Amino acid sequence: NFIVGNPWDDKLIFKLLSGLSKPVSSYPNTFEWQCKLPAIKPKTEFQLGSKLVYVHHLLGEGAFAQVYEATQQKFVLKVQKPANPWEFYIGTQLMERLKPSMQHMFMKFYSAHLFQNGSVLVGELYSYGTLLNAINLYKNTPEKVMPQGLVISFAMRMLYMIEQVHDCEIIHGDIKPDNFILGNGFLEQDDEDDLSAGLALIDLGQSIDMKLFPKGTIFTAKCETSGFQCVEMLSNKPWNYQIDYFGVAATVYCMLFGTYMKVKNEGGECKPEGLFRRLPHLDMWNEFFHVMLNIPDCHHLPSLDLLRQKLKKVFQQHYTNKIRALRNRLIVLLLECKRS
Ligand SMILES: Nc1ncnc2c1ncn2[C@@H]1O[C@H](COP(=O)(O)OP(=O)(O)O)[C@@H](O)[C@H]1O
Ligand SMILES: [Mg+2]
């Protein structure tokens, strides 16, 4: 039952990276440049060490990075100061541990460029915006919120995704609507029963590799670097994989209400704010959040498969017929937003 205070500490990360049989530098894709980070701005040109690259526009920004669209087929550039070789390590590892079939669920990194004061990562592109953006689009519409059938559908894919990541003994560490993105697969999704298509997960900067740590290690940090806090962090309790369970539930809560989840303690259990009576499938959602939020300990993680089945049951009873229309409607909204 080993203990590590902070898994996101820079000193710790440098120690793990430095203490590797296969340094990141060893990878073929990675490149180390002595010079400072090049000036990168939309509608400009610069050479990525060797070949010239054209940046068309800024797709999105986070607390750590700015992501631009680039060409010469289109891809993206993830720029951040200081350098973040860690993301490349995690991304590289993840594709290696994953089954080849499941790689399309996550962003692939083609190459990494490490500068003196920053890093630039070249990665796959997803052109139809984040899950958060999609949630915001509905607010303008009459429904004001995502249809349940799409919520449930997106939810089951998420549970399926973290299951694959956790099998790799990896923790995402930052599961939010901002870090979910919509790509072509969502557009071309033809098989509803296939959970591998229509949703992709990104932002591996805050990810944790459990392989590097002893068996049964635990973390006691009371918040994630951006300040993201799960239930264990609030309760001063230890945690490892629970943070991703909490993240999925927070992301699903957002699809349901279009507002970030807030937590409260009622009786002996932890519950989210405002699960009102008129909410469809209220029983199912109460059960879903109860399990995802109230985990007794690190050794009793809820079955991701079981949760998925409970949602699948409700989906098969009420939304198999209506799903195509709901997806088409969303597709039109995504196209409209992308036109802007
Ligand atoms: N592959 C991608 N395609 C399109 N946009 C992306 C891609 N990756 C990231 N983004 C955009 O970048 C923003 C944040 O990127 P992320 O990787 O989460 O960086 P950070 O760690 O700083 O949050 C997102 O809101 C998203 O719009
Ligand atoms: Mg992010």
Author numbering: 735 to 806, 816 to 1083
Paper excerpt:
When incubated with 1 mM ATP for 16 hours, Bub1kinase auto-phosphorylates. LC-MS/MS spectra demonstrated S969 to be the only prominently phosphorylated residue in Bub1kinase (not shown), in agreement with a recent study. Our crystal structure of the phosphorylated kinase captured the P+1 loop in a conformation that creates a steric blockade to the active site, with the phosphate attached to the side chain of S969 pointing towards the nucleotide-binding pocket of Bub1. The phosphate group of pS969 points directly towards the co-crystallized ADP molecule, positioning the P+1 loop in such a way that it would be expected to prevent the ingression of a substrate peptide. The position of the phosphate on P-S969 is very close to that expected for the γ-phosphate should ATP, instead of ADP, sit in the binding site. In this position, the phosphate faces a highly negatively charged environment created by the directly neighboring residues E967 and D917. Electrostatic repulsion would be expected to extrude the phosphorylated P+1 loop, possibly explaining the conformation demonstrated by the recently published structure of P-969-Bub1kinase. Thus, we suspect that the conformation we have trapped is stabilized by contacts with symmetry mates in the crystal. It provides what appears to be an intermediate conformation of the P+1 loop after phosphate transfer, before extrusion from the active site. Collectively, the three structures likely depict Bub1 at different stages of the auto-phosphorylation process, and are consistent with the idea that phosphorylation at P-S969 is required to remove a steric blockade of the active site by the P+1 loop.
Bub1 and BubR1 are paralogous proteins at the core of the SAC. Contrarily to BubR1, Bub1 is a bona fide kinase, but its activity is believed to play a marginal role in the SAC. Bub1 phosphorylates Thr120 of histone H2A (P-T120-H2A), which in turn promotes centromere accumulation of Shugoshin and protein phosphatase 2A (PP2A), thus contributing to the establishment and protection of centromeric cohesion as well as to Aurora B kinase recruitment. Like other members of the eukaryotic protein kinase family, Bub1 consists of a small N-terminal lobe (N-lobe) rich in β-sheet structure, and a larger C-terminal lobe (C-lobe) rich in α-helices.
